Amino acid sequence: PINIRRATINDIICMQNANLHNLPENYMMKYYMYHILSWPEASFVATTTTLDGEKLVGYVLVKMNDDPEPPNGHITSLSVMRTYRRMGIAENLMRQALFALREVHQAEYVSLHVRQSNRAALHLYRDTLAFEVLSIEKSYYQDGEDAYAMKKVLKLEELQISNF
């Protein structure tokens, strides 16, 4: 039973261990100690909930306009342990990640790079969430693949953490 936490820095070793087991994105341990030590509030992680530690099961890292211009939000990488998916998990760990990405820092437009080649992502990621497209960047991925951009406007009241 996945619990949806607020992501701590303790969970960088166990976070990045998942976006690597389950993803073709090799990332360093700096580029986690600055997502979660610049804008640590709006990047969420969620996995295992046992009482009477925890196991990583799925996470969500979300940086802002790192590079230089009206307060733009981004989302770096997202994944989940297979034997856990299709049970929300992914599908409502982001309705909070946006629902803080315009509450704390207050940024008006999300953004990202989803491959596809891809069902899971380029579906409840433009039909559930609604997130147009913008530039379809070709070979912008490290496999000769071409991957959708995805913009996603966010105006507070029209995306709260309890519409379900």
Place this chain on the structure above:
Amino acid sequence: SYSMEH
């Protein structure tokens, strides 16, 4: 899945 190579 932001690409730090490219």
Place this chain on the structure above:
Amino acid sequence: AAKIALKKYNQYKKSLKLLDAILKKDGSHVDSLALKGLDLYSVGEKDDAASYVANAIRKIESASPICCHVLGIYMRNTKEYKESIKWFTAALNNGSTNKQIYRDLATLQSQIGDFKNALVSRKKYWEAFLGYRANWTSLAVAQDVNGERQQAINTLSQFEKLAEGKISDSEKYEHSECLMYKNDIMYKAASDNQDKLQNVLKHLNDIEPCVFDKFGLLERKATIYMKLGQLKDASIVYRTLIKRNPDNFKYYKLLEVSLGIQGDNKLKKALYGKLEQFYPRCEPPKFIPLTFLQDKEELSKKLREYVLPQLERGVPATFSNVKPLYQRRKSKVSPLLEKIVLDYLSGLDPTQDPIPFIWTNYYLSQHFLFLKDFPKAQEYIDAALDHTPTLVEFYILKARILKHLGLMDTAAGILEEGRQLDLQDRFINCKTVKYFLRANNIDKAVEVASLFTKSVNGIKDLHLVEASWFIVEQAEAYYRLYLDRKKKLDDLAEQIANDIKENQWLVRKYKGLALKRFNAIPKFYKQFEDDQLDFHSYCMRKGTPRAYLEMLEWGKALYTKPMYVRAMKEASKLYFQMHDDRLKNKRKETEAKSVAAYPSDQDNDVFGEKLIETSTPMEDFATEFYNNYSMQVREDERDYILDFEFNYRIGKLALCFASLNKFAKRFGTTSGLFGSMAIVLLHDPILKKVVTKSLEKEYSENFPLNEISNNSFDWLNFYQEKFKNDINGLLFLYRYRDDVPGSSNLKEMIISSLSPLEPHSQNEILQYY
């Protein structure tokens, strides 16, 4: 003249003209030598860099202040912190103007522990840059560390007052992860004192509009409101915080005490109904209130009404969304539960409702892996897999099973045929290449998993991507693919004498490689903490200390994290054995792209030729490995069994007694290993009576130390007279088979007493152990 060189980067090819020219008449002078080397590191060659930096430290003792700082800007980069403080101080107490040195240093001697003399040498910058709030934190982050919170809490409320009645968009994130953080400190003095708190609550009530964390405050408000006996006012904050992310329990269970109704089940079970009605079908409402119940009439209602539905849809955690209630409370659940499932597999005509027969089998072929009925765990999985063969989540359950009954090889096959079900999506592409590394199959592990890892193989590009899942899995191959290759040159006693000289290589090529492999697992942690450097004084521009005050407190307990641990203990049992053994080339140049770790610069010892046999693996296992994790490790979490081997295999032992002891005040003397870890120390120089004496000082009465000296009393039986099935504690006595001489008595009463054990493991302690 070098001014145009020193400016030529902060790539300082201009500095060459100095080492071409400045090395004209007068040669042996600093300043010019030092750029030539700071460049080297900001220019590839590190080897050739010190032959300058160090060939210029033999013309000083202080030196050209302006130049001591192009030397300390490298020491701060060749990891050498302690020594850098000096190269800087050697500017300051030599007349340097660059008064930003009191903040290039204070973000160094702050890391290397010295937090006392961190503030004194940081506040001293704060005066020359006092129009920059990203400094007015470190005079209240270091003060807040040192332990004077009022000098912290007052240095930032003399910010919140200055600067202006003005906070534009630049600082629009400043007055949040900040003038809220103040409340984390300005309340963590009260502790449980009513004198403050109300105000620390009324202050937290003041900002709200200015506090921009929305969450993350509710706790120093919505639990300070609970800390003064007003159970409401907070039960009305958690009731609005549960409603903020009800997919998380943390804030939900508390609310049971928020409404004082902890031990009142009767309203408790009903509380999560007027709930469920509110916040519809999100885990908590339903789950939590089935972990505190007692009625084979009630329980089987909310049990069934939670389960079945997930089946009819096809959920892989249809089980692992309950694989918790099967652990901390079986007997009561896994009876009602075992009977509320199969009892639903009667109208699943596999030609009417199929996405039910296929998945209400990979639950039973998961449920009957707990009971370990195994026989009835390859039935459902297989019979499930003999209906839909295109559901990679059966092969995993077949390769967890089949692999928990030993057959390690055969298991990864049922996984390979799962991998081939989909090339892309490394969701199994590793898992398939995990098991084929747990069967020693390191070859169709590298290929079969290098496919999505960018040379001439994978395991090379997976070091510059962290990946400490793989190494400390690729050594738990090699380390097990050695005690058998090294069961050849100890078994025999043309191709028979020539064959010894082949299979008795790989013992060198793995024990060599397998230890060389674990050093990469440490080194990362060495450099995980050694990359929290630029963040001391550039997490402050961001204005994120609340989060940052968790990084320092993550740093000390970094060396005691998950993967540093199993990478110690699974290394000890390889280092510890090279210090109780010394006492008592074309294949190398042609197979060097299949076991390559790093660039041809660093790793000069391909197969750890040195690592394989070092003058004293004691001041290696401590400098490389251990004596860092022993400096940090917290007390009530430190393996004492390892601790009592480390100070024993060195010489100490004096410490073995004040190490075997503190293992007792955890278990309580009648545990397994504490018996064996006493026995061994039955009785180094004469002046090592003292062990026996102290061993006989307290622990004389219980258990016993009075036939130790005399050839008696075949204590194999006594050693196990508490009480045979301590197989944790038996193995010990043999591991060291030399100061615990009877040797062909224990192997049976170790072997013959693992029957009621798990097969994969029952036949693991064999062959190798």
Place this chain on the structure above:
Amino acid sequence: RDICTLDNVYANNLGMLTKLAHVTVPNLYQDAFFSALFAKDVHFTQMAYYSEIPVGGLVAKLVPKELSLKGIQIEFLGVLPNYRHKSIGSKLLKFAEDKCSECHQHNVFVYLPAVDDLTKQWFIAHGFEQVGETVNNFIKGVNGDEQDAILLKKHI
């Protein structure tokens, strides 16, 4: 969407068709040929997944120029047991016989084996007929067995 959808069999899949072969059409097609579908003759494919998780299969060629057996062949077409039954892989023909007039091709060939009267008295009930007669030592699985074939046809 209904229950039984489909898609094109992207070379990331394939192995869910090799598995959906060697089960549907046991002992037919070599253990590397399918990899040899995308590695001059044009060869169609389509993995027909149902509900969510795959449950059928079809991957057929396209012959043009000697007359008699021109158009689109049917290298295999099958779907797993206790499925086909429910129309999960009757519809692939409509998305294969489509490829005939939709790609311009009068006929469609389907070389079913001889015994398979269950298959040969069913495929007949869709728009096919025993064009010609029996054969002789023609079908031979990657093992060493051999059988006769039965042919078929349908114009448009």
